[PDB]
């Protein structure tokens, strides 16, 4: 349990992502990371780090959450 790996974000995509391209998201909060972040999973399983504070990032989360 304590020796599990931790995934972190070292960069934030600077280009917004279409919601029709998103499949799911993860919340990164480990103090082991440089900072809290959001990881988007695209339709094709690609992972992308985004800034939790940007309006579109929050609007996406709200959408994926309200989704099925």
């Amino acid at each position: 349990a304590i020796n599990a790996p931790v995934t972190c974000c070292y960069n934030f995509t600077n280009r917004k992502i279409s919601v029709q391209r998103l499949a799911s998201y993860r919340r990164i909060t480990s103090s082991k990371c440089p900072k809290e972040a959001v990881i988007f999973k695209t339709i094709v399983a690609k992972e992308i780090c985004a800034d939790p504070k940007q309006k579109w990032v929050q609007d996406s989360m709200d959408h994926l959450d309200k989704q099925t």
Partner: antibody
Amino acid sequence: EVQLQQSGAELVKAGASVKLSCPASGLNIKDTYMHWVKQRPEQGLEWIGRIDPANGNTKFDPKFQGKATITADTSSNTAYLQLSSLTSEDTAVYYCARGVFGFFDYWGQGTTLTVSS
Amino acid sequence: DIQMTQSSSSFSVSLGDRVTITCKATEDIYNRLAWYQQKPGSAPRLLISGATSLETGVPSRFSGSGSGKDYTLSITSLQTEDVATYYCQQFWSAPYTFGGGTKLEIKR
């Protein structure tokens, strides 16, 4: 690791104002949202507001507008909570916490505020 | 605002058995619920967020689940250190709000 320090205790006269401070270490408050939460034995936990130390924007629970002023300093990595024209209804325990998403994974030990004369 | 309420504000329990605390939201909150534990002299401690996500330093006997408007925290083989007050909190939309809390007491 992440750790938040708080003023600890405060004694202020009714009608006066007070400014509570919460210094952070182990993280940079720029990268997150700093919140303040009020707690009373009787009425429990209450979220007051948050501040984005990066741009200085705040969000408040209307119930605290004009009584609570949240401010921050990225240099000293400190968050502040100002309370104006205090009343006995204001005496309680005040916590500051981190939480870009809305829940709070890191808290300060809290600062007790007693409105007395 | 969204109002959070908990089944009861208190439960008398026994060391070792399973304990369940219930939370009910005023409206759907899409798993954006968090659970906290708080003992008499300190700040609340985050145990679970996202309704299911367990904070790292939290014992595996703690777990949560539910959806829409109904959520529950579950503690298996209750330990004495587990006796405290538990609060549910919603983070779907501001103003963020907590449940009134459920205090655990040991029966005798």
